[PDB]
Amino acid sequence: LSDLEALRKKIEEVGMPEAVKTKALKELDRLERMQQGSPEATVARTYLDWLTEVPWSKADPEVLDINHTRQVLDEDHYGLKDVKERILEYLAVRQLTQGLDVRNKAPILVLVGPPGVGKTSLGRSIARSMNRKFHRISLGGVRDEAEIRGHRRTYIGAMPGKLIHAMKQVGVINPVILLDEIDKMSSDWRGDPASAMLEVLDPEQNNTFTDHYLDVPYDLSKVFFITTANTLQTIPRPLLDRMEVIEIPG
């Protein structure tokens, strides 16, 4: 009790970074000064909800054990022992890898095969076996940088992009997020789809991902991303060049 007192409290207790908390308190101070229910106050309150409800340090317990993953994959899919062995190998190297090899070596995972081979359901199995939340974001036909990174809150109708919506729904910093159909993004982008997707997927960059709505850096580096495609042929080359491919089948 009440809305703004709770919100003040919320700001100190969520693991929010020091600069972000400063910016948030400065905005709460201004909000407290506006005409309640005005469009300006509605915009400001909405912004502070976003900053307080995206996860900052809440994480689900880390449980990666490849022998358990093996048993989960076998419950969920029949056969596919070659695919399953590549998945386990990929995961093993993460269950062990140390450094800023993690920024480099760490290519982006892509599962590739035609429809109905079960690519999304492999993702869900992986996630389940590590006890992590799973969220799927469809890229099929996505045609605008703003769907990925939002608009500045000064524009009418502005909100965050899909990545920050997902972090807020999942409520933890370490989900598994599956980007589906990275080979079917529109060729109509005004901006650069390859760069925009590298800002999310590349571990050299995604620790300070900048959603134009949130207007502060946000750390996507604890997310385990999986991408999928039917073909490699329509994946932009800068992405492709960072991808580790698992073909289904496989």
Describe the protein.
This protein is an alpha/beta fold. The chain folds into two domains: 1-56, no CATH class; 57-250, no CATH class. The protein has helices spanning 3-13, 18-32, 39-53, 66-76, 81-96, 119-129, 145-149, 162-170, 193-201, 237-240; strands at residues 108-112, 134-138, 176-180, 209-210, 217-218, 224-229, 243-247. The strands form two sheets. It has a five-stranded parallel β-sheet with strand order 2-3-6-1-7, with helices on both faces. It has a two-stranded antiparallel ribbon with strand order 4-5. It is globular, with a radius of gyration of 20 Å. The termini are far apart. The relative contact order is 0.16. ADP 2 binds at residues 77-79, 119-120, 124. ADP 13 binds at residues 78, 116, 118-121. ADP 10 binds at residues 77, 120. ADP 12 binds at residues 78, 116-121. GO terms for molecular function: ATP binding; ATP hydrolysis activity; ATP-dependent peptidase activity; identical protein binding; metal ion binding; sequence-specific DNA binding; serine-type endopeptidase activity.
